[PDB]
Design a protein around this nucleic acid. Sequence first.
RNA 1: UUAAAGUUGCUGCAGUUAAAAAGCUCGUAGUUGGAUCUUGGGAGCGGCCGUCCCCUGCUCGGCGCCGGCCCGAAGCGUUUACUUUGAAAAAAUUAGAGUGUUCAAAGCAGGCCGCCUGGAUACCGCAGCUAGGAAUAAUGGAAUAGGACCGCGGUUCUAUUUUGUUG
Lengths: 151, 262, 149, 129, 185
Amino acid sequence: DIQTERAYQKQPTIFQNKKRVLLGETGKEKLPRYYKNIGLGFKTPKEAIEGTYIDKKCPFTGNVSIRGRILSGVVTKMKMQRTIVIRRDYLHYIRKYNRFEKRHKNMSVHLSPCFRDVQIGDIVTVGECRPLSKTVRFNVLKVTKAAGTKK
Amino acid sequence: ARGPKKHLKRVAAPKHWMLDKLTGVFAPRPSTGPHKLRECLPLIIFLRNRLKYALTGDEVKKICMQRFIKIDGKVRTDITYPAGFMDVISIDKTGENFRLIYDTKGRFAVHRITPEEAKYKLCKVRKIFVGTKGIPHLVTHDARTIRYPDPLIKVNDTIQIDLETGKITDFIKFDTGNLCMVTGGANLGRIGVITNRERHPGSFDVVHVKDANGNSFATRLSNIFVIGKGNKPWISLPRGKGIRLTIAEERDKRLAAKQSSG
Amino acid sequence: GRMHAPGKGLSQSALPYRRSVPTWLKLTSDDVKEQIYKLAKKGLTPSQIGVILRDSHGVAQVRFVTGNKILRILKSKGLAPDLPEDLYHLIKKAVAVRKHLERNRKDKDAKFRLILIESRIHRLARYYKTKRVLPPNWKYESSTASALV
Amino acid sequence: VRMNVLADALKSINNAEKRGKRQVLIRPCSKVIVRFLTVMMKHGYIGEFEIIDDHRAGKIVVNLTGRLNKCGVISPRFDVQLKDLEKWQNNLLPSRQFGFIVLTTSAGIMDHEEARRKHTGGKILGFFF
Amino acid sequence: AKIVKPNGEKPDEFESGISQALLELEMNSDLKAQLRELNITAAKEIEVGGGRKAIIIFVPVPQLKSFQKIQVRLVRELEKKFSGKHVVFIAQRRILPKPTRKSKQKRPRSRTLTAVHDAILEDLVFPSEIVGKRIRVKLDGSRLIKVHLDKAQQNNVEHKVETFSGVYKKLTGKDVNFEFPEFQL
RNA sequence: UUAAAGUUGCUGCAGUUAAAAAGCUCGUAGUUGGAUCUUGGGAGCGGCCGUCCCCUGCUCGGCGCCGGCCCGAAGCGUUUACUUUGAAAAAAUUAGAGUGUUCAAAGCAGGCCGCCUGGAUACCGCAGCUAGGAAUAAUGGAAUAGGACCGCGGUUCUAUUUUGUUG
């Protein structure tokens, strides 16, 4: 489930090679989780505390700082790994014709695997961070469910 | 470009220097110093267009090279040294002191002070720093590093320092009810009393300051400089007391002065 | 007027202003619920149930004497059909038209009416998809229309 | 189909005003129509009207008087500010001595003079003079 | 006894007298077979404008039609119990406030102010149902609703229209008139 | 090249005969979409009414009253557009305050017999921040009830003001 790659995946805060009492059971085989609060009233969910994934681009359990702008959008595509595309809609005003035209420009945000009950068309809240790839500059902070989904 | 700039145009200058439009092409670019580029006043501009002691740019240089100009108890020979907010300009030969205080409008003004007033300086602290061996450090708005300050000095407070030594004398907390000054933007040089401080995480905070006659305005936290404990300022205030009366009472008082003078 | 016809119609029911139970009616709402359950066990649509009750049993509406409509009562008891009745009738009509076109290839007007009926079917099915009555993977096709009644 | 009920109501009112009838039958009512007719009552252009309450959508019978020139509806609801109202005053009114613009503000449906008095602006509805 | 007040507080003296008259009446008559579970919620005594008064009797919602089944007899029994003061039956309905963005279950539309006022107006007079409402707005902007009642059972409720208008002005707060048309039936 | 051009028409053009409704129909994107959810008064001033206070709540203070009440605050309130205010928004140029460069285009000077000054103000489209209002338009509640409240029964890891001074 973990370390499917050529290199070992570890968190560079937790030292997991500490001497124990017996190197057996009853006090072992439970790694201490590292997590932090990102501020701005965003609560850290419990599954990031209780999870087992090791990721460097996670907003909570990773070396990513959140600052700047906070935007929102709707989920469009879930194809490529740990990075989704959201869609933003706005109204553009034209001075000559006293009316509006509405445009869209989609952007790719990085999806941490903490949020697993996410589908297409959900209201999502994103926050600005450092450039993690060529076209990714935002991370997922909270997910709001769509219209309906009673079961 | 390929490097730092060294020239400043007359029209591409801050307006509070209050220069004319056709006597030259280039402005006196201030040298690197304690204060910034926009919110500063060079010694050439002050000594030529404010005190009218010199006429040309050579004569103010001949003034400055005779070691007659003192800034904060130190002799400065730079012709374009930036003299910012509450910088003490002392002339030993003529025998008077100045403090650079904003008036009601967005400009500097000539404000003479007593010599006993000219032995200290109010300055705003910027950040709290801890040195190499756990020693505290303090950074002011004019970049004067103070070693071993009081533990009660916080980020947005203000301190009064002694000029001839360089030590902290006494300090004023930043709280509601303290008299403050606004430094920057549309509200500049207005004396008022702090009434509120709104908190905005992730952005710039905004405060609410009340005037001496019920008027109110709002500026950011970075444009706030506390000058006194409560309703009593610690320095001498210029004429007008930073009230920012609007144009109607200015016209009425100008008409009254022209009637009483003739 | 109509949706796929140039004519204009003004033939529809006109309810009276009074929404009160008349004094001459002697049917308590449990009895008309039992009669609705009996007629549904006889295998009838809610529209035909309302027709039979209004003609024979003297009631004006179920909704004026009971706090639910006929389909709401049938869904609460749990014997309502899994498909809406108007979409089922449209599928049945489209199946009959396609069966007519299996042997008559010269009837262009019936092909035009088949196109109109299929457009109405898709238009109703889109609304029933947005109202979450039909599953999202539902799709009206030809071979799907033969297995369904 | 029927998409702007208020435009239809003022069109029927203006048509029966030009015809010379004394009573106008508006088939669909709305709260916006009630506020518009209340403003036209309070400024003295229409008379004493009614609401014919049935259980689907009420009808309105308006007692007419010969003081109305035209009733119009601006479609769609353009948002107007306080500095943009004077533009509408010059290109919509026949004179400055009379004529009123009904606009939808957050303080309620009201005319342009009360909108200037309460120091607020909103969306356009129509006009009458 | 018969008082079921929704909060555990002291019932009033005139309301207690109403309940005592009701319990004494259900012992001395044969109506106790249809009055074992029916209970009064509250009561009030207002001043109808003029020389007459009225009794308002509050009725629970799920027991409303039980009181409508025998509404014909108890009004004349309370008329002969008192001297000349009229009596009405008004159901007790909770009014929920309109939600705002400054201020949770979705508010049902049966608890709205318009629906509660319409139900109170329809339950105000039982023997004559409403066959039409007309709203007259006068030149000062005030509303004046006139209510048309059916031709059948007119003389029983013909003299009570002033009391009905008074209790509707007290409970709701807008003026109402009553009329018996002769056009349709 | 601009106005004249209501001959490019958003304000604000025309399509029977002068230039101009696809032969007809279905149909996705786009645009536009019925009615309906809280009304009326109280405490008042002057001669029914232009103004004035009212119709969101459950851990610390201090601003008061008798641990308690009250108010103010840590902490929060379904989200938007629209509307009003505030911040920041280079100068020059535009409007515009003052001023006898002999007037004016200009300029920021100048006037009293060392002193007094002035070198304002407004605008700055959209997008971004902030605080009052909910009329207008779109969205969501609870229907196969795990619906909202209220108090009773357990599964896990842990807070030293409390099991004589010590594992």
